[PDB]
Design a protein around this nucleic acid. Structure first.
Lengths: 70, 71
RNA sequence: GCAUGGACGCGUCCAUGC
RNA sequence: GCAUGGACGCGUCCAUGC
């Protein structure tokens, strides 16, 4: 795969690494563990959004884009 | 794949999604582009570290592990 | 109270782009 | 000015251990 692709695929690959964990349910979990698992969801969500934002920043830099392809 | 395994695999599933981009070399690129891609690396290493620290912090809590296991 | 992890708010500084 | 990322400081909330 080309470098431009390597970066464009980041947000999705990360989507994949994480979808299983934050796709599981903890309806029976106690209030204190429910809060901790919710904190995990927030942590993953923020890592997901950050990478996503980072890549959008990278692909809006005409310089970075030019290099990634020629 | 139980709930416990589901969470234990995180740091690894994350390394996977990220190693391709991170193995990529850009040492032939211009200085400003080299800087942004270093910032990319800095950024991704922090995401991996945050998640790992989160998972470890979680798996050290007897209350949460008990739940994930099934007790 | 001490420490750890995360989220969030305020500010300082560094880099990059427009 | 705007945007993104990183470092640092201060503060708030949650959780855990002692």
């Amino acid at each position: 795969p080309s470098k431009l692709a390597l970066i464009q695929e980041l947000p999705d690959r990360i989507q994949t690494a994480v979808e299983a964990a934050m796709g599981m349910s903890y309806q029976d979990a106690p209030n204190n563990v429910r809060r901790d698992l919710d904190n995990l969801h927030a942590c993953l969500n923020k890592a997901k959004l950050t990478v996503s934002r980072m890549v959008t920043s990278l692909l809006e830099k005409p310089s970075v884009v030019a290099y990634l392809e020629g």
